[PDB]
């Protein structure tokens, strides 16, 4: 991954940029314009982030299992060419935060 | 004001996120009405003979303490809903009462988890 060339872009909790079907009603359904808007790069799920967290810190966090995942879906994305797209990435609608 | 109790005598009782045990009023049908379940968890804990005190710890103050321990704000979470839990810090009368208090606390309606 490498810190030097990496930017993290967390997407808002109320946005589903990668599940095509969206069930607000009981049935099928914004989209990929998050994805390749940064292309002009890879997706990291909140559920993977949570497994990685337990892997790093030790066993489950038993007090949270019965409730929603508080982490954010994100997209993991030259050294001097960093601060730029960081600012750029906060522009996009739906994005919660970005980190450089 | 700060609470001060020994580890060997403490039980943490985590409150279900949909239970407002410490709110005297809630909104029902668009009006502010008294909360009929106010202090239901508190009262079940306080009424155990083996319990010395029961102190509310809000998720807001827990977050503040978390940043005071770990440093800085967790920037990317700020503005979003606090995922920590409201809790009661329970002080047992004696260390041998802790295991019984925990099990008994788990059964209370409105309790999400307990840590002994
Ligand atoms: C699964 C792993 C668990 C990770 C847990 C993450 C760490 C806790 C994150 C909590 C961040 O959530 C944040 O909480 C605090 C207090 O509740 C709130 O920020 C606060 O700032 C001002 C003052 O600075 C307070 O007066 C006010 O109570 C609140 O808005 C904020 O509204 C919320 O956005």
Numbering used by the authors:
A (entry chain B): 54 to 82, 86 to 96, 103 to 139, 143 to 165
B (entry chain A): 50 to 165
Q: What did the authors write?
A:
FtsEX comprises a cell division-regulating integral membrane protein (FtsX) and a cytoplasmic ATPase (FtsE) that resembles an ATP-binding cassette (ABC) transporter. Hydrolysis causes a conformational change that is transmitted through the membrane via FtsX, an integral membrane protein with two extracellular loops (ECLs), denoted the large (ECL1) and small (ECL2) loops. The folded structure (residues 57 to 166) reveals a central core composed of a four-stranded antiparallel β-sheet (β1, β6, β4, and β5) and two helices (α1 and α3), an α-helical lobe (residues 107 to 135) harboring the α2 helix, and an extended β-hairpin (β2 and β3). The helical lobe mediates a physical interaction with the peptidoglycan hydrolase PcsB via the coiled-coil domain of PcsB (PscBCC).
Three different structures, with resolutions ranging from 2.0 to 2.3 Å, were solved by X-ray crystallography, each in the presence of a different detergent. The detergents used were dodecyltrimethylammonium chloride (detergent 1 [D1]), n-undecyl-β-d-maltoside (detergent 2 [D2]), and n-decyl-β-d-maltoside (detergent 3 [D3]). In all cases, two independent protein molecules are present in the asymmetric unit, arranged in such a way as to keep hydrophobic residues from their α-helical lobes buried. Different conformations were observed for the β-hairpin and the helical lobe among the six structures, depending on the presence and identity of the detergent molecule bound to FtsXECL1. In any case, the crystal structures suggest that changes in the protein backbone and side chains of the helical lobe occur when a detergent ligand is bound. These changes create a cavity in which the detergent molecules insert, with a large part of the helical lobe (from Q111 to E127) affected by the interaction with detergent. Residues Y112, W123, E127, and F126 are strongly perturbed upon detergent ligand binding, with the hydroxyl moiety of Y112 interacting with carboxylate of E127. Changes in W123 and F126 stabilize the hydrophobic region of detergent 1. A similar interaction pattern is observed for detergents 2 and 3; additional interactions are observed in N131 with detergents 2 and 3, which are characterized by a larger hydrophilic head (maltose). Full stabilization of the hydrophobic tail of the detergents is completed by the same hydrophobic residues (W123 and F126) but from a symmetry-related molecule.
